[PDB]
Amino acid sequence: GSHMTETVPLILLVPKSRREDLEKAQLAERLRSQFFIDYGVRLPEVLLRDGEGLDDNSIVLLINEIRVEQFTVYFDLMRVVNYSDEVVSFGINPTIHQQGSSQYFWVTHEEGEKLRELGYVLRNALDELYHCLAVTLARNVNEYFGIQETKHMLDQLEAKFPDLLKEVLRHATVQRISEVLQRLLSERVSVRNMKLIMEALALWAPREKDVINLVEHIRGAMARYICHKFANGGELRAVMVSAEVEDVIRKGIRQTSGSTFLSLDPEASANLMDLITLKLDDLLIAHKDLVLLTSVDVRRFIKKMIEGRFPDLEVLSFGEIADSKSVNVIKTI
Ligand SMILES: [Ca+2]
Ligand SMILES: [Ca+2]
Ligand SMILES: [Hg+2]
Ligand SMILES: [Hg+2]
Ligand SMILES: [Hg+2]
């Protein structure tokens, strides 16, 4: 460990009424172990604290002792991941939580079993809580991960692939590598496969000195791993960006002698955001459980544009999902 982790614990405010059960379930320990498995980096220590005034189905995450997000988890119910309105036709009244324009639908255990037979996918409450936390923690990676962690990882790798590390370091500094890794994690891409990441840096770093651009190439190299992560072991649920919207973005792109950036009139960008908002508004699958699909040329710009309003909606390129299996496009923007 380094200071990055060691000096800055995460705090979960939980209901007093659930504390003992969350201890028994080893919430804190399992969050830490699973996150490491899933993303390849270590979280800080996780402290539980009883939260004043919390109902029985609420959790708050504090980073740096500051409230970051409040989650609703129906501990005694089941979440319907691929909900549709058809469910109400069957005489089920779900329990519904909304955060922004994302909606979450919960049913009884008995109702769940019924729904499964009709091909709905269910998630248990602790599994949902872990997903919520993980998504939010990935985004906030810079709070607990940096050069010290990167250097450790490089050192571990070196012990195994010395010549590979040698080559990479000739073309990228530790700082630059750390930046690449943070940018991957912040977009929910795992860094567990360090060997592959390093092979891609050895290929690309000699030639690409702009960090944003470099990251895009690395993502490309890692395509299989990105896809497998997002899709889990299930179908990939997606919203497609229309050729129309792609073009608005494309026209706004300016190439320089340095970085490539998006340059849209503020009114124009606001109007485009209003359109994206409108198209997303009536979705019944939560944003963290979706991806937006677009062309490689516009992917990173679309991500930057929407992340203010829609922080939990990741954006993949068509190439990134080349190894996909079942894909379900639920909507076009
Ligand atoms: Ca119900
Ligand atoms: Ca407006
Ligand atoms: Hg169940
Ligand atoms: Hg969530
Ligand atoms: Hg995949």
Curated annotation (Swiss-Prot):
Keyword Cell membrane: yes
Effect of mutating residue 88 to A: In strain: RKS2985, RKS2993, RKS2995, RKS3013, RKS3014, RKS3015 and RKS3057
Annotated keywords: Cell inner membrane, Cell membrane, Membrane, Protein transport, Transmembrane, Transmembrane helix, Transport, Virulence
Localization: Cell inner membrane
Keyword hit for Cell membrane: yes
GO biological process, one term: protein secretion
Annotated effect of mutating residue 17 to N: In strain: RKS3013, RKS3014 and RKS3015
Cellular-component GO terms for this entry: plasma membrane
Outcome (variant: residue 52 to D): In strain: RKS2995 and RKS3057
Source organism superkingdom: Bacteria
Effect of substituting residue 96 to T: In strain: RKS2985, RKS2993, RKS2995 and RKS3057
Job description of the protein: Involved in the invasion of the cells of the intestinal epithelium. Could be involved in the translocation of the InvE protein.
Family of the protein in this entry: Belongs to the FHIPEP (flagella/HR/invasion proteins export pore) family.
Name recorded for this polypeptide: Invasion protein InvA
Organism the protein comes from: Salmonella typhimurium (strain LT2 / SGSC1412 / ATCC 700720)
